[PDB]
Design a protein around this nucleic acid. Structure first.
Ligand SMILES: [Mg+2]
Ligand SMILES: [Mg+2]
Ligand SMILES: [Mg+2]
Ligand SMILES: [Mg+2]
Ligand SMILES: [Mg+2]
Ligand SMILES: [Mg+2]
Ligand SMILES: [Mg+2]
Ligand SMILES: [Mg+2]
Lengths: 559, 195, 559, 48
DNA sequence: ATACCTCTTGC
DNA sequence: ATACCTCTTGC
DNA sequence: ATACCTCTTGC
DNA sequence: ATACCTCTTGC
DNA sequence: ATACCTCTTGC
């Protein structure tokens, strides 16, 4: 029935028991420079809460949903894999929402034309630790001398696990607390699994072989980073980090192979208004002057005519490939979009995000179903397979069935397939763009692969750091023991129930550039209205939510 | 959900409905999120036709690969496309005393797990309604062009802007060490004969 | 039902109540220098836990398992001895495992050729003390003003008790806490005990005489070291210590007397492959040219021929000798090894380690039986007695039974004995090596004897400090009293239940040298594989273990 | 070239001799010689 | 033109 | 802030 | 350590 | 006080 | 008197 004793505070220049060590700031600054450059500084802070780990051990676990895949035709459902599980927790902040609110986004997006990522740093403070002790009256006392541990993997020794890919970054609301996630990482494993269908006879091999001892790697924080111990008075801070990576644009393109170059001169123009009064080239398709890449005909049509190269490309879908560890969907860059979609035509390439209350779902809404959406980029660089086709070289037309392959004809005798599903047109002439950011649920920057050769882009984030990326930040509560402890014993050790709270504050800097009017007509711009109006404000209860928004609004020539 | 005792059957469990999990995919239609669905930043390795022979002005020739294969599902017998094979005489490794003019040989199987296991591949209809119907899926089993011993994986290709991979590794002692680059305007990102 | 009061923290430059005083680091550094020297720096930290002593007294206890020895034929089982028991606890860290993990070991061992011990220092911090107070609800409160005591025997006044000899050093896992052991030391005593056998009639004298007052020595910390008192804010640190001792090699030898020098020229060579096509010297054994140490014959054989000196030596076993205080096994240097062993032939010289979870045994395994092993060095410098023999000087052969003594003939009329059991061949020509390290359970360095003349080596560790060795570190909880205390009273004093936790961190430095290829064939190297693969990783539960590994892998000429 | 350094807790793969291959590295009683092939990228590295 | 199984008892 | 059982590997 | 809804009544 | 799996983007 | 959709490859 004691308060513990209240203990007394000694005082240095950067801290003590009853001395704050930090300052809260989650404010965003725009600073206009000469020539239309802007320096955007975004501050962000949060109160973070964290419990002691389940157990102070590292574990090696295997996951096995064999049963589900055992089904036949449920290949895609495979979740098998191995992983190391640590006692540490990770503080990840890589995600649009952590840093900006809508108002901000708006601005950026409407007035700028390109954006560069500059630097970033973070710090922790006002640390606090309390212990619970318990008729179920729970009491809480500060444990003045206990500690919080912190480690920053600046060397990037640990494997990299961006958490946004699972919606586990921090929260997006400055005024409400949040937490870090428990850290874990992939551990190697061999695995086989033969695809099958409903109609498939017997049991296609489906097994977990084990682990290529060659491929083994087991890391630990303890052995690789220096751990800091903070007490309340303590505080920690990373330096400032600078990024090396390309800029990101905020404009989208729209021309496709069809709109490149000099359109054909029309010998004949309409003479009155009306949406049926077309113009006419006025020349026999087989009599026109110009250039093609087709040696046989004399036809020259908007679809035949030569273009300098090729925007976009086509690839297989839905493709699953498989290697040593099981199958996985083959990614695309492009996505699709347009008039012939409307989220329902929604296909391959468009990404889809799913998430919780901490990241956008309405706070007050009950029921644990995740909120979702499919981002549909503005950039018209994807494909409409249905429109594709292939024909015989003789090119005698109108064309015969025997000389043409359609998205309609079935391949391999399977009805619901056609060449477009296994087609691929990437090649030296291909040209395209990087994905666009996705607010607020998009990852912001990402690490590059350590392969000898490399992707030309990643699909999860727009900024890929060329060199090293900022090291991960882990934390964890220091074990607080009871008076009984026998390491020699097999049992798990008992600890005092302990937990901690601390504030975290970060600063992320971008640099961008104002855009300027070039066309006569105005352009698209994000804006509020009666329809969405409520998405941007709390409910009479404090309901909040963050809807997704687009990024590359304005157009730009492609050529 | 974690296991509570040792034993190679005590798996852990995510503990969430596959169609209820949070996260990201590159698939606009479902709500499924599985280790195979989930989005990855890009793609290691690629898949290519085999055994492919192409032909130009001077005759046909095998189309080369970078990757090779390897792993648990091989053991030199599964040995396929990509793995290189060296053959040679006494001056270069074959036992000096051994008589008989048959060359000694081997197939180098790299350690780097960057190749493909075609059998495992598959393709399905966009509607992605599953478990899947035969009509909506193409397998390494179904025969293409009406030829039994063929399937899409033989003419498939997945190289693309997202692809990522490594250079071959050296091969002692029979590997070439360095090599000249082609005088074309555009160039290979690597050669397969030397590092 | 109070929290004690929580007390308030004052602040100096090196500490306070809510100020951390240390940094956790258990990381290992390799720093490559010019000429292939490396500086290996190994850091290591632990959370140490410690309870108040059973009693604040020094006691003088005698141990007596008379009964067991009383048996007859159970001489070896004698455990008698005297000892002082202190209230202090000892922090010992002298043991391979404290400092390196396997990964490390690997490296070292595969790429280096010799290793030197350089310096070492340690420190303690983030001290904490709590008190337990108690329906059995135990509550824990910090006692802000209580203290921890610490003493460092830099003068080496206390008798030296390396704890690894009993597996009581600290733990080997950075991520799990551990503890110090209770300190005690031998106290002199006189004792007699006549060996006997099963078949032995009556009661062989078997007694504890007492104590040669001459030989008496009783030390106390208090009277010999300065004790520091740390409070939470306090922290302590030893200087840095430098070792003076020989290097240790990481290569083993293999030639025996048989492989020294110029082999005999073969006048006749094989002409085809096959493991039966031997070569032939081609000269009558009694007609060859060369040198022996045998004046009588003319025989010259690989076993007769003279060698420059003698590798290895032979000694009695199993020998027990006895002096003033009872019997004890006579130690050997060599051990044995090879083809004719396989842990089952395992004899005299090979050492055997036994230990708990804190030191390698599987953490999850239940049941208090110790894990064990017998280290079998790679260096081929031991003997195979069975092979030995002795013969009459006349050397007329083939030899007669009357002229030869075998490992088979029984000595003293005892069946199960032969000369080799009491044999000894050490002598001026003998040559040999130091023991090799034993990871992870081996002691690392050891003190030298204060005798006028000295051992040429120790068997428990490879590094013996020539001068002084780093002083022992003791700690102990300061008595925390109740309000009642009467020193004048005979009863034991009552104390508040108190205990403490603190982190300890050390740094140990070696310096080594890279090795280089010299032979055509590759050599042995430690490596992982399917078979051992799991020894190096945690179980799905957090099971851990550390298997033993070898040290002198590569070979080296001996001559 | 550049020396490598330990980073994981577990040791890694390493080329080594043993009873099985032992003879590949030495001449026969006749002078038989041979050179077997060996691997090159033994150790692992994160890819990401 | 020999230095402790390389270069290198060099520099 | 460890030197050969003190102070004191100081001075 | 408050300046006209940011940074910034700074520089 | 984060740099490309150590020390060490140090010196 | 042409520089990457302005002024402005200026200053
Ligand atoms: Mg650093
Ligand atoms: Mg570094
Ligand atoms: Mg393997
Ligand atoms: Mg592998
Ligand atoms: Mg002193
Ligand atoms: Mg002294
Ligand atoms: Mg006497
Ligand atoms: Mg005496």
């Amino acid at each position: 029935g004691s308060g513990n004793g209240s203990g007394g505070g000694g005082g240095g220049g950067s801290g003590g028991v009853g001395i704050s060590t930090g300052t809260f700031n989650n404010q965003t600054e725009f600073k206009f420079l000469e020539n239309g450059w802007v320096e955007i500084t975004a501050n962000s802070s949060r109160l973070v809460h964290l419990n002691m780990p389940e157990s102070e051990n590292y574990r090696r676990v295997v996951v096995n949903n064999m049963d589900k895949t055992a089904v036949n035709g449920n290949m895609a459902l495979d979740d098998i894999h191995a992983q190391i599980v640590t006692p540490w927790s990770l503080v990840d902040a890589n995600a649009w929402g952590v840093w900006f609110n809508p108002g901000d986004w708006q601005l950026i997006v409407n007035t700028m034309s390109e954006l560069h990522l500059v630097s970033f740093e973070q710090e922790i403070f006002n640390v606090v630790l309390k212990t619970v002790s318990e008729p179920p009256t729970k009491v809480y006392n500060n444990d003045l001398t206990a500690s919080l541990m912190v480690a920053l993997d600046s060397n990037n020794t640990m494997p990299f696990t961006p958490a946004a890919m699972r919606s586990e970054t921090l929260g997006f609301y400055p005024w409400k607390p949040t937490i870090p996630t428990p850290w874990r990482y992939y551990f190697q494993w061999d695995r086989t699994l033969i695809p099958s269908h409903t109609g498939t006879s017997g049991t296609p091999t489906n097994i977990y072989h084990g682990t290529d001892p060659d491929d083994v790697q087991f890391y630990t924080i303890e052995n690789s980073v220096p751990v800091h111990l903070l007490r309340t008075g303590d505080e920690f801070a990373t330096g400032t980090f600078f990024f090396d990576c390309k800029p990101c644009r905020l404009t989208h393109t729209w021309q496709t192979n069809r709109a490149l170059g000099l359109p054909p001169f029309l010998n004949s123009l309409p003479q009155s208004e009306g949406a049926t009064n077309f113009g006419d080239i006025g020349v026999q398709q087989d009599k026109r002057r110009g250039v093609t890449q087709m040696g046989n005909t004399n036809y020259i049509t908007e679809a035949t005519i030569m273009r300098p190269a090729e925007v976009g490309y086509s690839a297989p879908y839905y493709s699953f490939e498989a290697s040593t560890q099981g199958p996985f969907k083959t990614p695309i860059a492009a996505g699709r979009g347009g008039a012939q979609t409307d989220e329902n035509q929604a296909a391959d390439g468009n990404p889809r995000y799913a998430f919780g209350r901490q990241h956008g779902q309405k706070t007050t809404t009950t029921g644990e179903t995740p909120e979702r959406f499919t981002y549909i980029a503005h950039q018209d660089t994807g494909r409409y397979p249905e429109g594709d086709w292939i024909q015989n070289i003789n090119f005698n037309l109108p064309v015969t069935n025997d000389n043409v392959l359609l998205p309609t004809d079935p391949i391999g005798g399977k009805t619901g397939i056609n060449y477009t599903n296994i087609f691929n047109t990437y090649g030296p002439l291909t040209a395209l763009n990087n994905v666009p950011p996705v607010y607020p649920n998009g990852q912001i920057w990402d690490k590059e692969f350590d392969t000898d050769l490399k992707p030309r882009l990643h699909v999860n984030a727009p900024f890929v750091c060329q060199n090293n990326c900022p090291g991960q930040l882990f934390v964890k509560v220091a074990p607080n023991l009871t008076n009984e402890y026998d390491p020699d014993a097999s049992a798990n050790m008992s600890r005092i129930v302990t937990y901690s709270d601390f504030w975290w504050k970060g600063k992320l800097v971008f640099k961008a550039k104002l855009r300027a009017s070039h066309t006569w007509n105005p352009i698209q711009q994000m804006s509020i209205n009666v329809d969405n109006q409520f998405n941007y404000v709390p409910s009479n209860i404090g309901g909040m939510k963050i809807v997704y928004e687009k990024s590359q609004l304005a157009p730009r020539k492609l050529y």
